[PDB]
From a paper:
Progenitor sequence of the assigned 28 sequences was generated by ancestral sequence reconstruction, and the generated sequence exhibited L-lysine oxidase activity; thus, we named the enzyme AncLLysO. AncLLysO has a fold typical of the flavin-dependent amine oxidase (FAO) superfamily —the Rossmann-core fold, which recognizes FAD, and a hot-dog-like fold, which is important for the recognition of substrates. Taken together, we assigned a novel FAD-dependent enzyme, called LLysO and bearing a main L-Lys α-oxidase and promiscuous monooxygenase activity, from the database. The main-chain amino group of L-Lys is deprotonated by an activated solvent water molecule, and the hydride on the main-chain carbon atom is transferred to FAD.
Previous research indicates that, in many FAD-dependent oxidases, the Lys residue at the site would recognize the O2 molecule, which oxidizes the FADH2, and their variants quietly reduce the activity. In AncLLysO, K387 corresponds with the residue, and the activity of the AncLLysO(K387A) variant was reduced below the detection limit of the activity assay as expected. Crystal structures of the L-Lys- and L-Arg-binding forms of AncLLysO(K387A) were determined at 2.4- and 2.2-Å resolution, respectively, using the cocrystallization method. In general, fitting of substrates into an electron density map would be difficult at the resolution of the AncLLysO(K387A) structure; however, the substrates appeared to be fitted into the map appropriately. Differences in the binding mode would affect the substrate specificity of AncLLysO. In fact, the main-chain carbon atom of L-Arg is moved to the arrowed direction approximately 1.5 Å compared with L-Lys. Because of this movement, the distance between the main-chain carbon atom of L-Arg and the N5 atom of FAD is about 1.2 Å longer than in the case of L-Lys. From a structural comparison between the ligand-free form and the L-Lys- or L-Arg-binding form of AncLLysO, substrate binding appeared to induce a conformational change of a loop that is formed by residues 251 to 254 (251-GGYY-254); cis–trans transformation at G251 is remarkable in this change.
Numbering used by the authors:
A (entry chain A), B (entry chain B): 1 to 586
Write the structure that this text describes.
């Protein structure tokens, strides 16, 4: 299923209609929709990627001794994300029996719940105090306010990060009298001082985000749109810098407390409501969604993914202006030779860093001409991520009654996910994932070191099998220091043995430069998104993907931006399998 | 004296020997030494800068109502920095009667001691606890260990940041048996648990830094060169993450605690031993040293600083290869037109960001040829800095008995300097913050906002005078939030009135991309420095300046790298006025 053919060759002066650059989720989805709806024959729609793999930031791996998929990138989806959920599960989403679902893609994909674990057993390790994640709720059940080594404002004492986040967003929303009046029925103060909940929909958030005013009379930010305030600016203002320190650390990496757009951060933090929805993954690896869309595209005659082929530049000044608006110059990495593709539409299905790495002197990127394009490319923050998969001969975490889920710390490692145990071998997988709150610089000095971790034999994992992964091992300095932090996080009551295998991915590396993106304060997001899907009025050049999506951090963001671009400029209707009530904006 | 002529015009096909690109301290010093020692006629040595002023990261300003110089960039020097000190004060430095000193530069420069303030009155505000900076010493005088809201290891309890830093460096030095044996006499444990001191010289540090081994058998970093360990990596290892949090926040700007080269950080923290030396500035503004060096150069007929002229690219492939190795293409910013200069030597007197903004496709930078150059350009961290100068109608800080010096906080502002009061007007100047790497994103969302602070009339400061500075005002959001943090830092015992004028510079802006630079762990600094002063053996192309100096953060670093380059490639001797015992390395 994951052996989708990739062509590392070239075809000098190939003449097509639509060049898609990026074999990530948005680029694959674009090519799949175009050929499946028969807008073009598959030989006129071609995908190019510089990688030796399709999928981009989805990359599922199997490590010797562990007969289940680890994730280097994307792990999971939410069933409220209708494009990715329908593509995985079939339709309609109402149908609760998976056997009565109608598949959209042929590839077998087994949806399984994402294990979230037990707050009673999962750890929070902050300023050297070891808590269970439920510690705040247990105190509140006994009429107590849990003390921490953070000096919160007095009115926040005993709040958890979840509860305090909810109270902040509630307070900011309800202080805007227009929001209070129009949406108060969906912004809910429960009975307990700690209980705040939201029933605001995607549609509601789209009405709110551009209008919401910060109404706090002696704040520095008073009477400004929440859109124009950084989320760290806004959190400090509401709960003091000690409050920000608490939320930034206790939130974890899945929680986004960088100084990004506060209007956009609000829905990110409290969800687009329909709370029958849960986190799931794919038994065969989350990258299966990319392989399934790619294979659906590749089953049409003339379909081709050109791998190890890097776009350098593109021009309107070429010999074939009579048949083709654009000449694209690709670098065939295997031969180090340049070749030309001729096309009438270009889809840049790639993030901010990838755009910046293209020739900035051509007609499209030239900053002397297209100052608006360049400003809007710079409208999103490139948030670093690293993934380190570690294989142990046994699940040492079970000694603490931990099955699954995430432990969270202010230590530089930030967070570990206890991924699974192979019931035959007992070999067990931990994910370390980090990058936020300055931890990139801590880890970069260690991951840049030249001396690699050496693989070690375990059950069903021979040196010959493991030596195939020599190249993708973490550094010994990074493994040693992470092991040190895991011992401090879990405490002295559990012995943590050395791992036998690791897998390391740095998503800051070119061409990605980021794990995910975040809208900056002070940009009109509702206007930048349509702009990015077709920057120049007289050019059939489109940007799509997660980076300029309004579901940043998510495959659904990449799919939604591609889908909007398809319906706007490629004359496609909503897919039959996609509910018309799934909101995609203007 | 600061009206040094700048030529914003062009001279198509100008034919010279030495093109210096960067009218910063190093570029000015290069041009001054070359023409003063008559290595070249002044018409054959030309300086080019894209700015509309000389000085680079030295920029002194006067604000209406305040009849003294504020500093946007460099502020002060140490009398152990012999090039900058001799240039300012005259020679020799042994002569302690200033009337028996022989001036080196004619421009009037009045050295005045840098006011350091009173640790009894200066504030430290950490995790919401307000201390006087002397609090740790006062506790130690009463036999006590000052408690803080940081959970230090038990062996560090009651230590100040200074004392704990000294202990860390002592412990690491003395654990290397070769360092213990060879240099133990200069690495001194005093009687009190808190007392550690060093008599290691510039020369001693140059022997030590490349050899020093981290000898800690339980550490992840054991048996690695201290050179190969990030300073945050090393500090956490020695005093725990809570210890790093204490040092990073309590240190201030005086401390560099980013994850940079530990071998280089050691002397940065504990000095090149040479006590009796103090901090000074120049009454006429610290940028006076730049104007003095520039004017000495510009006294020669044919000398020219080409301002508002930006180097784009340079090539060996041009019509005049018989007389001139290199053709330089400059962009004349006033006309947006390109012009050519022909030269046999190129001096890039510019930081990392400036080099990266040049054409990366030419013979020199092209990564297909010179991957080694590119790796060495990336050997230093670009540390962000900004400057916000604020003018108040009175020195509100005097209510707390504060004359001068720095308050330090874990609030995002990090540090403020109480600068001066105009005794006629009483209008008084704060340097609000430089921000830093951690806090760049907190402040950037506010400084990028479009609504600028509105100037307000004060004594000897009319609206018409102030409206000339409309362009360089901080944003309302940045001024309001900094004022909020100043109120929290100082407490409710002082009322802080609104400022009437501000001055904002962001040193992350192109072409600087940094306030200062920091060597990365894992680079052989002793080998990169000589490499950068002449990267290619067959080319008369040189890099000098602070960025690849071993006195990063300092004018002295820029002067020393220019001086070494001059003695190595341009046939100059040490200047007559520079003591032969001033160590300048290999
Ligand atoms: C650590 C991590 C965790 C994540 N977790 C989740 C999660 O749990 N759930 C989820 O739904 N999402 C998650 N995501 C996000 C998800 O992986 C991405 O949003 C999505 O995969 C991005 O799709 P895209 O189309 O933007 O392209 P990308 O995946 O960014 O792919 C872009 C492609 O363009 C190629 N390219 C760039 N420049 C060129 C060039 N010049 N020539 C040729 N090819 C070029 C690249 O090689 C790449 O294949 C996560 C991301 C990361 C990093
Ligand atoms: C906030 C702050 C505080 C500081 N405090 C002190 C202090 O108290 N004492 C001290 O001694 N040092 C201090 N420093 C450092 C000191 O200011 C610098 O180390 C020093 O001025 C750097 O000089 P340089 O020769 O490296 O060049 P720079 O100052 O970096 O000048 C480089 C020049 O190159 C030009 N340039 C770049 N690219 C091009 C191009 N393509 N074409 C043409 N021109 C180009 C730029 O316009 C610029 O003028 C401070 C720095 C900052 C930011
Ligand atoms: N390693 C560095 N460059 N540190 C920057 C510190 C600030 C600089 N020394 C100054 O005097 O303001």
């Amino acid at each position: 299923n994951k052996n989708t053919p990739l062509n590392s060759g070239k075809h000098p002066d190939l003449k097509i209609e639509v060049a898609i650059i990026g074999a990530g989720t948005s680029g694959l989805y674009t090519a799949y929709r175009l050929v499946t709806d028969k807008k073009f024959k598959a030989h006129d729609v071609q995908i190019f990627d510089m990688n030796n793999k399709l999928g981009g930031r989805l990359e599922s791996v199997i490590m010797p001794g562990m007969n289940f998929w680890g994730e280097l990138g994307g792990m999971r989806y939410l069933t409220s994300q209708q494009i990715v959920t329908t593509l995985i599960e079939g339709y309609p989403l109402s149908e609760k029996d998976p056997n009565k679902r109608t598949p959209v893609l042929k590839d077998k994909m087994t949806p399984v719940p994402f294990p979230m674990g037990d707050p009673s057993k999962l750890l929070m390790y902050l300023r050297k105090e070891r808590f269970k994640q439920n510690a705040w709720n247990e105190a509140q059940k006994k009429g107590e306010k849990l003390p921490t080594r953070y000096y919160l404002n007095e009115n926040d004492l005993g709040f958890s990060s979840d509860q305090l986040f909810n109270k902040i967003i509630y307070d900011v929303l309800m202080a805007d009298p227009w929001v209070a009046e129009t949406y108060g029925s969906k912004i809910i103060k429960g009975s307990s001082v700690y209980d705040y909940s939201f029933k605001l929909t995607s549609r509601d958030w789209d009405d709110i985000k551009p209008k919401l005013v910060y109404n706090f009379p002696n704040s520095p930010y008073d009477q400004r749109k929440v859109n124009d305030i950084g989320f760290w600016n806004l959190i400090k203002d509401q709960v003091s810098q000690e409050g920000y320190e608490f939320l930034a650390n206790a939130g974890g990496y899945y929680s986004n407390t960088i100084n990004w757009n506060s209007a956009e951060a609000f829905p990110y933090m409290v969800g687009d409501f329909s709370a029958g929805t849960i986190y799931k993954t794919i038994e065969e690896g989350y990258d299966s969604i990319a392989y399934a869309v790619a294979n659906s595209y590749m089953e049409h005659e003339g379909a081709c993914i050109w791998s190890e082929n890097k776009l350098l530049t593109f021009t309107k000044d070429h010999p074939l202006t009579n048949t083709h608006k654009y000449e694209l110059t690709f670098l065939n990495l295997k031969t180090n030779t340049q070749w030309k593709v001729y096309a009438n539409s270009i889809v840049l299905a790639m993030p901010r860093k990838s755009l910046e790495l293209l020739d900035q002197n051509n007609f499209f990127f030239n900053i002397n001409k297209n100052s608006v394009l360049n400003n809007n490319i710079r409208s999103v923050i490139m948030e670093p991520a690293f993934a380190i998969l570690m294989g142990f001969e046994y699940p040492w975490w079970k000694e603490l009654g931990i099955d699954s889920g995430h432990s969270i710390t202010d230590l530089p490692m930030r967070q570990c996910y206890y991924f699974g145990t192979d019931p035959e071998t007992n070999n067990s997988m931990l994910l370390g994932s980090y990058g936020d709150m300055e931890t990139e610089t801590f880890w970069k000095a260690l991951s840049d070191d030249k001396v690699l971790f050496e693989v070690k034999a375990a059950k069903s994992a021979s040196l010959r099998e493991l030596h195939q992964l020599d190249d993708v091992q973490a550094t010994k300095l990074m493994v040693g220091e992470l092991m040190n932090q895991l011992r401090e996080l879990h405490g002295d009551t559990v012995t943590i043995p050395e791992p036998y295998v690791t897998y390391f991915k740095d998503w800051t590396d070119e061409p990605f430069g980021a794990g995910y993106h975040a809208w900056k304060a002070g940009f009109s997001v509702e206007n930048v998104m349509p702009y990015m899907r077709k920057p120049l009025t007289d050019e059939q050049i489109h940007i799509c993907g997660e980076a300029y999506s309004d579901q940043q951090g998510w495959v659904e963001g990449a799919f939604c931006e591609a889908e909007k671009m398809l319906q706007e400029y490629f004359g496609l209707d909503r897919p039959y399998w996609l509910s018309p009530d799934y909101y995609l904006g203007w």
